[PDB]
Specification:
It is classed as oxidoreductase. Keywords: cysteine sulfinic acid, cysteine sulfonic acid, peroxidatic cysteine, oxidoreductase. This is part of a larger assembly, with eight copies of chain A. Chain A is α+β, with helices and mostly antiparallel strands. In chain A, 35% of the residues lie in helices and 19% in strands. The first copy, chain A, is built from eight helices and ten strands. In chain A, helix 6 runs antiparallel to helix 8. Chain A starts with 11 loop residues before the first strand and ends in an 11-residue tail after the last helix. Chains in contact: A-B, A-C, B-C, B-D, C-D, C-E, D-E, D-F, E-F, E-G, F-G, F-H, G-H. The interface between E and F is large, with 77 and 80 residues.
């Protein structure tokens, strides 16, 4: 039984390889967002490639006030030995904590559970509310740059009181334009149309460009990198 | 109470603006994959952009064997008037069917609805030709989806099934192995020992083995999706009207 | 389960194209009756004719202190877009609010639930009590002039303390007259017959003519309008 | 817990002052529509006026293939005495049967239960399916001519495969016209518009005039009778 | 699931052709006994004969401090019309109230429920306690004089602290005698036989004649009226 | 408790005459039976009634009715109690008495305290309960009235007639018997058109089909009930 | 569902031919033991003999502070008439009260009735001490009359055991092993048994088998007088005397 | 259980082996007396064992087999018998059921352990005919148990009820009661015939038991009253 967007993140005590912490409070108290990502088992390739990819984009998340937290169905001693392997054989240190979940208690609480079903991403805001859930299969690696676009676009929508269009900031229709939430009454719709402060197709489709050039380009930067062909792969220099 | 990944898509009969069809049978019959995407309501701005995003990428989906089908909490008549408006004002036809879901029965069945919600009624179901749910994505109503990622998912997943491979993070642009694909790790020691003795794959450990079996067409197909996503489109559709 | 006559209208909060309102609280506070009519779907021809019909008789309802309120199992956005189509293509403005009922919560609470079942007129008094329920099928459009006759007669019945006869004010027996509520005791029955106060056919059948000439002809007006062939239609112009 | 519109009339045996009949079988056997109308009690003024009104319109219902049947929460002997009073005083005979339902069994099975609640009209087709339900309060006499209009419109709708506009045959928009049931697919809507066989406002609003001069004039005749003041009232002639 | 003998009459608010009253309160308030008699339907021959019989014995009941109340599964308007027919065609006015029981609420609460089953007499004292219940079939009219005997016997029994023999005051063993309630201990039984203050047959069978002449004669009058063919019939 | 119209509950009972099945034992003889119940043996009011029943045993035989008692005591108590009556009162008690220790038969019949164990069940030859009477313990039954009930019922069954109040001394119609009212409109017409019965109304029709014997036999019972007894039984001993 | 030994006698009000009493309150507050004996019906032969046997042993029971009380599934009126017949025909007055149990309410609670249509199972004997505690229960069938002198032996030996803080051997006071001796309650600990053998205050067969003879010459002979009466053919029968 | 009920079908482990109840004895056409004990190596329970064993042949004469029940191991049971035979010099012939867990006791409604007492007297049909519940502080009177089975056998065979204190009843002595008439005609015919002495129609008796049978019953009660010559200690 998975949680829903809008619901607060289930209050729980968890043991990580950094220590015991209480969720979502550990991050709410700090005024930080956090992204939780689950993993079927330790010493597995796809999950490892995700750790690395997350760690390579660690400062981007810190820059966005987002903390990272992993989830795996293995002991805390396996978790440490696993991070120790990646830093030694791949050359990348994994900074963020990983929740040690024997018995699969935490995964059962989140509705992720087989053990193969234990995947998915929880994007939680600074209020402690679940904002986005992704559920990739264990045979497919996630795109961490899209997760970055999600937290970015979501924070801009919050602070500017705007909805975010498809493929933003590269929308086919309005590009980098941000959608003004539609009117829910007759009077509001009639008022919106008369004011002439918003570009519009119809009363329920109004947009503008309130976002700074910095924030638009920061958002397109993630997609630029994701599409980009990497120079020198990590398996070579290791 | 959602269906988990790996679980078969719930047997149901839905009403669309194209007729009445049974899921997942309708697409399984054709040996097609299908992506189902849900929406809170008709005549909503974010959902419209997503429709146009999907419709502009409709040809890409069909070349992979993926059909498209929408889900919205509104009458079938409302769906058609909505599809009429988009074609007239945006100049883009919506070729795929949309499930008419008044009462929210099929949304409630899939686990997308308590009352007063509909806001929660979103999410993407990527379902393979065997009728099995492969990927679920839950974007909020205030956030337009990245449609090129869905195309990346199906292509990688179809290559995964075909070539018997696990797909690395950021593929085809993985930081460790690039366009390389992961060999499913050994579950026994006698398979781990043999794998290391075989020396057929590039290895990092017994559990971390890969090769490059994907064609240059398959790989460049995947980069084109991500490239399109990253590129600011020359000439917008609002101005064309 | 449908909330029967006599029962107070179910306490509920509803979302409309005018805003968020509590029922029956919103209209009770104004000392107003309200007529809640439900519909299965937006952009449907039968419902459209009724919407137009109600709006063309809007002042007739206001004159009686009766507000109108629609119900449809669709989003608020469809509702407003549907009203815009009526105002453009038929050229008739729709003034009353319509409840947006996605998922069909209100309809289920009113027991109108298939979606095909979602049709019913609820006539509620200023005290917030259901007085009449009319259940029409989807393939049939309601005679809106009868709804007008119902409230007018029912308001008269309250103020004048009378029962209203069949086909009023065109009753085959007593015509424009209004019935005195029958005696329920032996003492009441005798005192009625010894008063010589009312016209009578029996102790349980007494009536008089207390309604003003305006009240009577106002009621016949509704029935005549429903009977008269309209001089040139609205689809033409 | 009422029987919904479009449902089959509840299977039951009832006692009338005509005898015992199986509902709705008795009328279905004949291929006849029937209107069941309930009443709180015998020897009640409003119900008496209602009986007289149904009585003066008896042959109209027969021509439409409709039988009438009343329901009152009193005994059968009370029913016969009630009918007898009406003939002796008002002059009009009551031909239709009345269900004697003490204990309120039939009234309860139909979800009409105080006893003041026992009001309601059931318009049921030749297939024993409920088509309309009207709930007037005990202090308000029904407009019987409206019931005649309902059946007529309903009968023309079924045969011609058309839906009936509001206020028909005097609809403000389309007049004596009838609605062509709306398309449910994209292809149905396109094919309807390219054919151009109906007068139209939109793909979902098509209509024609398939009703005969006589059918229309019969419906307006019901509405005119209801509208017109009766010359000669029944009370005057002792 | 009828009420039992000795059990208090079920509390209820009922609707009559005389108004709204609460049972048994309405009579307990007046310090009166009441006889409740149920009927299947209005405008029925046997019930009509019963109504008239109670009405002709109305003075006899009131003098005993007993009110009469009817029960019929029909509306209040039928009841009034029914009473009207009786005063007109039989020339006897029916004075007592009739409970209007549509839905058969009261009938069900008293366990009389088919509707044909709705029959039964309840004799209830001033304390509101049920003392006697007769259940006659609907095809058989009641012997109203026997209800009067029953009551008269109970009122004397309560006040004289005595039990009443079969066929009183015309018992084949003890005549118009009345039974002294039997001993329940051996000390009581010994003291009864030692006292010799009662005409006796055994220690458990003692009687005397504590009822007055006028009480006994009033009791034979009821049975005398029941026994005799009435001079002058009412239908004539 | 069992009701009027319902069949007497199937049961095996122990009496001082033996073990019998009820109501089978009496149905198998094509006989009516009157079951009367008593709180306890060696009790006064019950003894007077036993005597009263025994002194009328010929009148019950003459109607094809059998008597059967019920008391919450053992069979041995029963037989000793019958001995006492026979010795001290000089009257034989011929009818069986059910031995009901534990009160199982009383409980099933709803007679249950043990003081509430009183009731007369008149059951016809079909095993159907036709009448119930419940007197208190401080009151002796009027046994002649039971005799009137069975006679009238047997008369009513054979002649297809209803029996009026106080019969055969009814104040309206005397010894006349009531024709069951018509239930339909056509039955009501054909009744008043035939003129085969005396009537006050279509629902109130009667005739006099009871023979002079059946009438006077019924009047007998009431006369004996009203008669002051010449020579008392306690004096004879 | 029956009560067991050690359990307190169930609280209840009963109706007797002596009046209404509470059990065991009525006898507890007197310091009296009571023997409750139950019968299926009145005017039955086996039960009558038992009633006579108790009645002529009445003085023996009263000497031991023991009261008698009968229980029968019949009315209180059948009870008094049944007592009258005995006093008139056998010439023996029945002094103790009999409980009247129509409905079998009392017998059902005591577990003398479990299923249906029995009364036959109503044949129990309950021996209750002054603390209101069930001490002995006897269940003889209806076709077998009890041995009343055994009930006297039980209460006498039990009263001796309570006071002298001893256990009573088999066949006492004519036990094959220790005769009229009474058993010292066996040690329940290791050093209790050691101290018992170190004391030498008791005749012994083992640490758990120790006894003395604290019972009075009168108490032993009274107990033997109960058994002699049981054993001896009575001179002059009661049917003969009637 | 109750009187009239058949003995509960159970399989028990005793110190002579595993036997089926009540089948082992029913199939032998034998009565059995089952007496239960709280604990082994206990004085009162020991004195009963001796009293039962010295009367072993008397039960054999009546066609009665004996069986003990104790909440202890089978190995303890045998050591307990071994002690009696060595110290008291009386061999215990009857089997004792080993009931650790007190399972058999639980099924028999004897369950504290103090409550684990009671004699079940069971006929050759497997029907419980008598139940005796003595407290643990008081030893039984085995001769009465003998009198019970003896009276019941005569009661069955002669179709008679046994009076109180028989064969020493104060009213009828060694007389045996005829089961009372249940009907009035039976009660009527009983008094008319004159085949029985009587006090009433419900109180009839005769002396159909033989002198041997009467004297054999009195032997039991005489033995219980006799002061023993030479105590076993």
């Amino acid at each position: 039984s998975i949680p829903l967007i809008g619901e607060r993140f289930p209050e729980m005590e968890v043991t990580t390889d950094h220590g015991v912490i209480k969720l979502p409070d550990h991050y709410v108290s700090q005024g930080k967002w956090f992204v939780l990502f689950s993993h079927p088992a330790d010493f597995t390739p796809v999950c490892t490639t995700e750790f690395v990819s997350f760690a390579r984009r660690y400062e981007d998340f810190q820059r966005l006030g987002v903390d990272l937290i992993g989830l795996s169905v293995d002991s805390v001693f396996s978790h440490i030995k696993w991070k120790e392997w990646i830093e030694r054989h791949i050359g990348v240190r994994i900074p963020f904590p990983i929740i040690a979940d024997p018995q699969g208690t935490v995964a059962r609480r989140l509705g992720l559970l087989a053990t193969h079903t234990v995947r998915g991403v929880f994007i939680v805001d600074a209020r402690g509310v679940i904002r986005t859930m992704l559920y990739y299969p264990m045979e497919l690696g996630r795109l961490v740059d899209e997760i970055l676009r999600i937290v970015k676009a979501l924070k801009l929508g919050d602070s500017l009181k705007r909805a975010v269009p498809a493929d933003w900031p590269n929308n086919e229709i309005i590009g980098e334009g941000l959608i003004v939430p539609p009117p829910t009454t007759e009077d509001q719709a009639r008022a919106r149309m008369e004011s002439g402060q918003y570009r519009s197709l119809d009363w329920w489709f109004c947009w503008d460009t309130p976002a700074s050039r910095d924030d638009v380009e920061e958002a397109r930067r993630y997609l630029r990198r994701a599409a980009e062909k990497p120079a020198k792969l990590l398996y070579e220099e290791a």
